[PDB]
Paper text:
The cytochrome bc 1 complex, also known as respiratory complex III (CIII), in the electron-transfer chain of the inner mitochondrial membrane is a homodimer (CIII2) of two biochemically identical protomers. CIII2 catalyses the transfer of electrons from the lipophilic two-electron donor ubiquinol (QH2) to the water-soluble, one-electron acceptor protein cytochrome c, contributing to an electrochemical proton gradient across the membrane. Electron transfer within the complex occurs through the prosthetic groups of the three catalytic core subunits: heme b L and heme b H of cytochrome b (cyt b), heme c 1 of cytochrome c 1 (cyt c 1) and the [2Fe–2S] cluster of the iron–sulfur protein (ISP), often called the Rieske protein after its discoverer. The Rieske domain is tethered to the complex by one transmembrane helix and a connecting flexible linker that acts as a hinge.
(iv) +FCN: oxidized with potassium ferricyanide. In intermediate positions, the tip of the Rieske domain is close to the ef-loop of cyt b. Map density for the Rieske domain was less good at positions in which the cluster-bearing tip did not interact closely with either cyt b or cyt c 1. In maps of fully reduced or oxidized samples this area of cyt b was well-resolved irrespective of the position of the Rieske domain. The addition of antimycin A reduced the resolution of these regions, whereas both the cd 1-helix and the ef-loop were well-resolved in the intermediate positions of CIII2 oxidized with ferricyanide or reduced with ascorbate or DQH2.
Residue numbers in the entry:
A (entry chain E): 39 to 99
B (entry chain N): 111 to 383
C (entry chain A): 26 to 248, 260 to 474
D (entry chain C): 1 to 55
E (entry chain R), F (entry chain G): 2 to 125
G (entry chain B): 15 to 416
The structure:
Amino acid sequence: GKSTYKIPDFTPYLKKDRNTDANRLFSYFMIGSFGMLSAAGAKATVQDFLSNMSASADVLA
Amino acid sequence: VLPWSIGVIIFLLLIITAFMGYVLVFGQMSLWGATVICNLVSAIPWLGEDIVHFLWGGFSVGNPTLQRFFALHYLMPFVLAVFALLHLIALHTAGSSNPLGITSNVDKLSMHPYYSFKDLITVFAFLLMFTLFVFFSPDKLGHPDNYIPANPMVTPASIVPEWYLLPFYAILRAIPDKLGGVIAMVAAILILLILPIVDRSIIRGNAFKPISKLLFGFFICNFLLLGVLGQVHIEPPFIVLGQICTIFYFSYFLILLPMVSTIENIFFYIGSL
Amino acid sequence: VSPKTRTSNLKNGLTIASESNPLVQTATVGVWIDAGSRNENAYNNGTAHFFEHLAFKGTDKRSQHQLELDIENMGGHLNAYTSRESTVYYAKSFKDDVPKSVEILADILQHSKLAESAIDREREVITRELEEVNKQYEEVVFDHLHATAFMNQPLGRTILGPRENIQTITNTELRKFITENYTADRMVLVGAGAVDHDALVELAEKYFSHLPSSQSPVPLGTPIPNFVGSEVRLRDDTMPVAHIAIAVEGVSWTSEDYYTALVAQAIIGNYDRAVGTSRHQGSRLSNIVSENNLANSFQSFSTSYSDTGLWGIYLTSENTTQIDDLVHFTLKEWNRLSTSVSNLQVERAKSQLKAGLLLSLDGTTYVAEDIGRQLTTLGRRVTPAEVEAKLEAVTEHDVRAWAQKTLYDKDIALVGLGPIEGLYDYNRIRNDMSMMRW
Amino acid sequence: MALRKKNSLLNMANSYVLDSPQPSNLNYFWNFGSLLALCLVIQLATGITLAMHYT
Amino acid sequence: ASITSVVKTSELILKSPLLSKIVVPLAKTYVKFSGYRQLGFKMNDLIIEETPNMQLALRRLPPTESYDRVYRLIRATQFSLSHKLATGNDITKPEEDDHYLIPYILDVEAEAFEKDALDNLEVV
Amino acid sequence: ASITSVVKTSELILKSPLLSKIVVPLAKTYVKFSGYRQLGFKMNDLIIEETPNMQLALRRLPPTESYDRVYRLIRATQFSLSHKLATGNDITKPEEDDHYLIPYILDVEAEAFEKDALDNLEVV
Amino acid sequence: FSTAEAAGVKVAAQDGQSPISDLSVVLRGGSRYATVPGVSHILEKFAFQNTVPKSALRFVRELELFGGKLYTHTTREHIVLRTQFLKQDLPYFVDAFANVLKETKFQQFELTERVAPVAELDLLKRESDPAFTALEAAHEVAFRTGLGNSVYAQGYSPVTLEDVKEFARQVYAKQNVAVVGNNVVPADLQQLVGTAFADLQEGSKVTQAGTTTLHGGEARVRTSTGNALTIALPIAEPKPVYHALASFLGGPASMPWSVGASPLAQATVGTHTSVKATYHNYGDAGLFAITIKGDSPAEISQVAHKAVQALKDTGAEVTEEQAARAYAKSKFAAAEAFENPDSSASVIGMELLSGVSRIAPENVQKFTPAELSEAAAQLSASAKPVVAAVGQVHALPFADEL
Ligand code: HEM
Ligand code: HEM
Ligand SMILES: CCCCCCCCCCCCO[C@@H]1O[C@H](CO)[C@@H](O[C@H]2O[C@H](CO)[C@@H](O)[C@H](O)[C@H]2O)[C@H](O)[C@H]1O
Ligand SMILES: CCCCCCCCCCCCO[C@@H]1O[C@H](CO)[C@@H](O[C@H]2O[C@H](CO)[C@@H](O)[C@H](O)[C@H]2O)[C@H](O)[C@H]1O
């Protein structure tokens, strides 16, 4: 309300184990999973899409 | 360096654009030019043949290839316009250079009206040349074989690219290896990217450099000779001549310009002491 | 080769430590105490600093006025300071005025009146101090830095304490504080300059013999801090200079990485546009900052406490549109302690530190401060030969390994004061703690 | 100065997609602009590909 | 290439009697055919300036030298756009073709190169 | 619409007993349902400011009024992005909803409109 | 400090038991000798720039490898260049000073880009304190030229490269140079200075253009950045009793959170103001000053009256207690000045460059109450009081009001 050295209450949000490697590793697991599915999704997308340029069924026939 | 380097990519896109557009007529030169140029990709090791079949959409140049070249020929000019815009935005940080090679920050003129009205002169000169070809000689720059419909059975007497690709074709012929030749031909364009490094001059441009001007003159005439050799038959004595011209082309970038520009630096310093 | 630090104890457990210099004619004697604001709770926060005021307000013998006169007659001065973990009371005098000064210090520590009238008078003086620190920007920045880094923990509290406590501190709680904390096993009597050790031990036996001992004597410099990555922004558009501190959790006095953290700190180093030599310093950050006019100054720090520390940098800048560059380039220099430093930077920083640790001690007060600090944090004075060996033991592998676990991809505590509109949000600052290219 | 600010080409991208200062309280209806950019990219990619097969 | 390089190589040549005997006459002819003096330039006016080092050297020119350089650049630009050459006193005579800029750029580069060396020092 | 217009029309209504009897209660409910007070705003904080006239009026605010306005805008923005409403002392009470800006904008607009009129004077 | 001579250069050194040595070159080149205003400040800032053997860049990079530090300052009497290093690195530092005195390339770009901007920041930092300004203003009124020249370079009167080069031609000469080594083996220093400074010009003693003249007056520096007031009294015959009187009158507190028991300290009670009496001996004239700073011009004015009263009261009668307190505070001030490297170097520098033997702190004279009161009486009855007001000058006192 007046003193700026009294930090507002962050206890509803603060994690107790915030400085641990386990704590960071979890968030990077989420980021990594996301990057992994994006890589697998991009690869699938590009492969299926670009295959339109390979000889079509009537040409192969 | 940045507008120049983007400029080199513009030049590559123009070549691709023009090559695909020429195939669209589907005359004899269209088909056979597509066949021989697209088969250069077969030289890429391991996957080359697969890439060619993928480009063609089949086992030879045919309908799939023509329909994809139409779609890409329509697109590529838009890509080219974007890169043209990019090289101008990159240039805008330094402004245009000028024929003396010095700063113009001391003495500037507005683009309009001065260069607007000076541009109109060359626009009308260009339109006069355009008119003479389009109305009075519309087929002077073309190949009569492109008025014969594509026939995969009959091979034309001589399969050459359009004239503006001829120097690069002469460079490719000079190297006996297929992959070697493809690399040399691509290198002949990408080597433009090293001019910022191999020019060791402390002065910008050739206006005041008599030896550099002579070397530049030889380089340009050699480039025109390579063009001519691109459309002769593979016969003596043009085979060896094409190889010597190819060596000269590359040695300009790798040897002569670095040497000459080094010596001229010394002559300017000593000569003006 | 400096003279040996002599050390003796009394029966109560008071340490006496001295370093004589027969070339000077003044002497600094004083009492270093292993106690400070961090020993208060939330209710009596401010007490230690309150006492420091009252210590000079009169004793059972000498009144306030008599005290003033006695020191004036000595010829030198008395000085005191309270920090988070340490309190100091010292007297600089002439060679032969040392017994007077020891007697006055012993008096103000043991036998201070703490008269309700004086408590009530200082209660206003200290209240005015709350509204005038506001000007000392470096202190404002570092107090917010501790408050946020050690959020809701004792190290996070200020030394002055809240306004509320200042109005409610009683002589009872003052007396309780100094009875619990100012014990003989926590105190060191230090003499530097023209002092005889044997004379000082006698004076200690005369004046500090009736000091209480604590019930459970732990060794000197005995302490759990949980650092919070966080930010305080105190934007003030009317200030011309931005003051920014960035810190990570650093090392305690007795860490195995204490010297490695000092070497890493010296690789970044300090810079000040007002000093002539600063444009020519070898530090990469120095070169970036000076060439591009990014800052008026920066000062790397590695602050230690008994059980934690803060390692970071303090920046000042008027370049308000390029604060982003300043922060970006600083944190990319920290990244290089993890990715790129080699024997080149490490051996250069070691060379500079081997001298720096000795150069700092250039007067009797600095020597006394060094003996007192080391005795109250480590329990012993570390000889320059031991210090030279611990520095020599720091390799480039040690620096890289330390930076990879302390700096790389770690949370920071960040404080910005002044025109800091250009300082980006927490995420963009914290994203510069790593390099995607590595 | 950071390259993304110093180089004129990078700086144009930077100004639109990276350092661009946004209100801190845009709600999800401010997301349709990027969806429309996505639709335009999909229509360009699928449309140019259809043009390779369409007569 | 750096001005430092050019100056050092030139000094090697000027030292060698044989080398100077063959290079100095060539260099003088080269300068005559170059023809920059016919636009009223001095040799140093032609050196590329869009570099940090050169911008710093130009800022260190004495004000007089700096104002005269600006005039020669403007005058040469006006000859260039008109497709004329200098006549009379506008032509740079060989005795006026002084290396007014070379000392400044050599000092700028000296520090720049020392800084590069010292950035790579290894305590022995 | 100009603030001048809004203020003048409002004053016509407040004058008419009948009109005020029917409009004032409606206006009070409208303000209650509007709900800007639940984000800690005062009515004048909502007025469009990206105009020359409004920029001038805001520059004429006393420094304290100006600093308080900045805080209410930042605070309301933080409620908006968090999808929360003000509670307690952050809610603007009806007695705190003062027209701090209206006098400044009315003076700016008065001069702007007089200038327009006087630009069209005809000597008789 | 064993005074000797090495190749025409006066060298004083004192060995010690520390790993840290301080080597200082003291030059007779302070502002009282300044040819043009500000030249001595500029010359000080031009030290350790590019020399012919070693660039400023190379010097700083090598200094960092030795972990050495560099300190320079200008007084009214001297330029002092000090280095602090480890004992063993002495030869390097001697050679560095030799390069600076013999081979400094005074280049125009260094002046414009390096030296002058640093000199300007130096001054602005000093002037942030209004008391600094007031005491500087007071010397300018009291002496006009010589001692009245500004110590620092100011923007209104620019120093040129030719000005600095000429002054350096005078100052950097064996006749104007003293070497002072703290914690340096004296025999080793003499050997090194004897080889390094052998080819330095002999030159001639730099002199003050004109005799020192004393004047009274007022200076009214209107600033917006704080308030101060100096009351100075120019002294025609500098005597050591004024040290005792300055310490007696005092002003600063000897204890935290206190006012102090000194007359001038007691003049500040009820005000957020500080005071300090100082005495400046310059050999041939002196200045006794009392400076008061504060935030309130009304409070400064209030203290100023009490301050002049204090001086008059002292001229009446001093007690024996007070005289002993003066001896004690003065011996202490002397001792700490001989310890502080900055002031130490100048003290021995004065002994070597002039011939004024240093008064050891242990030999500081005890002045009787008679001698102190007599000294204060002469000051209260001065014909030439100087008053320099800084800040809200319309609200600060004038000489005739005091
Ligand atoms: C579609 C093709 C191109 C267009 C429309 C185009 C247009 C322009 C224009 C309008 C300018 C400024 C005016 C001028 O100097 O003529 C320019 C400058 C420039 N262009 Fe291009 N350009 C194209 C292709 C290229 C190519 C292929 C290169 C390089 C290989 C290139 C390199 C440059 C450079 C270096 C400049 C700066 C020249 C200077 O002013 O000194 N451009 N271009
Ligand atoms: C804003 C971008 C575009 C929109 C909204 C759009 C819309 C449409 C629509 C509504 C159709 C009818 C689809 C059907 O029912 O079969 C269509 C067909 C087509 N579009 Fe596009 N289009 C876009 C971009 C493009 C582009 C860039 C191309 C490039 C050529 C293209 C090529 C085609 C082709 C070849 C067809 C006919 C084959 C088919 O029906 O699928 N379109 N487009
Ligand atoms: C820079 C990117 C690198 C180059 C990109 C490569 C372009 C083309 C690569 C492969 C495309 C065709 O590769 C082929 O793809 C199709 C899916 O698309 C796969 O086919 C598989 O799935 C499809 C449907 O998803 C089924 O009809 C099929 O029966 C099954 O085998 C083949 O198993 C794979 O051999
Ligand atoms: C959306 C896809 C990403 C590609 C970028 C879109 C292309 C459009 C860019 C060209 C239009 C010019 O865009 C213009 O660039 C300059 C700098 O780049 C911006 O300028 C802005 O940023 C720079 C620094 O980031 C500051 O110097 C400037 O004060 C600020 O206004 C303009 O606000 C923007 O309007």
